[PDB]
Structure formats: structure tokens, C-alpha cells
């Protein structure tokens, strides 16, 4: 759970670059696939188990 | 035979349509997971 974003999956270092106001990203078909850690400000991918 | 390459490079619509049509149906299936269908919400955590 990332400040409201509830989900399940494996967290890994990403290679995306958000804009300096965006918290999380979605893929095509509108499903969350990356988030930013509120504390460390790093982008992490979310892959299904 | 040397002209075939021009006719194809400038054609594979029958193969592209079947791949694209199936992908559009699969994406349409996923887009149904964000509808209420006559409920208070679409999210089980609510």
C-alpha cells in the first residue's frame, strides 16, 4: 500500500522518468504498473506474481 | 521475381487485421473491469 494505492506484486527498480508532479504510472488499458516511494522518491515497477 | 519486393514493401493486410482484431478484443475485455454494472463501486476494497 503506497498512500492509498492498494495492490499485490513484486517491486523492482524501474527505468521510467515521471514528471516532477506525478506519483504513479499506468500502462495501456489503464492498470497501475509503477509507483514512486513517498519517502525515497524512487520509481519502482510492479510486476504480477 | 525481382519486382515482388517492391510490391510488398510499398500489402499484408490480411495478416495484420487478424492480429489487430484479436488484440482489440482482449483489450476490450480488460476495460470491463472498471465498470459498476449497477453497483455502488467497482473495487472490492470498497
Amino acid at each position: 500500500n503506497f498512500n492509498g494505492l492498494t495492490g499485490t506484486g513484486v517491486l523492482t527498480e524501474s527505468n521510467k522518468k515521471f514528471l516532477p508532479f506525478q506519483q504513479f504510472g499506468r500502462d495501456i488499458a489503464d492498470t497501475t504498473d509503477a509507483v514512486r516511494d513517498p519517502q525515497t522518491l524512487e520509481i519502482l515497477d510492479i510486476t504480477p506474481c | 521475381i525481382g519486382k515482388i519486393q517492391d510490391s510488398l514493401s510499398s500489402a499484408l493486410g490480411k495478416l495484420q487485421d487478424v492480429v489487430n482484431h484479436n488484440a482489440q478484443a482482449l483489450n476490450t475485455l480488460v476495460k470491463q473491469l472498471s465498470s459498476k454494472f449497477g453497483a455502488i463501486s467497482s473495487v472490492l476494497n470498497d
Binding site: 488499458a29 504480477p48 | 475485455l29 480488460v30
Partner: peptide
């Protein structure tokens, strides 16, 4: 990729299909 949706690979690889077509081509010529 997602929730409960998967894609199964074909039994025949693209290399195996090329082998079938080269055998037909070598036979007829």
C-alpha cells in the same frame, strides 16, 4: 501480463516452418 490472462506459445517455431518451406522448395526445383 495482468490478471489471469496468458498467451500460449506455438508448437512449431519459426525455424521449423522455414524447414518445411525449404523442403518443399528443394523438392519441386
Amino acid at each position: 501480463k495482468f490478471n489471469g490472462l496468458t498467451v500460449l506459445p506455438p508448437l512449431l517455431t519459426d525455424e521449423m516452418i522455414a524447414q518445411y518451406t525449404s523442403a518443399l522448395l528443394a523438392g519441386t526445383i
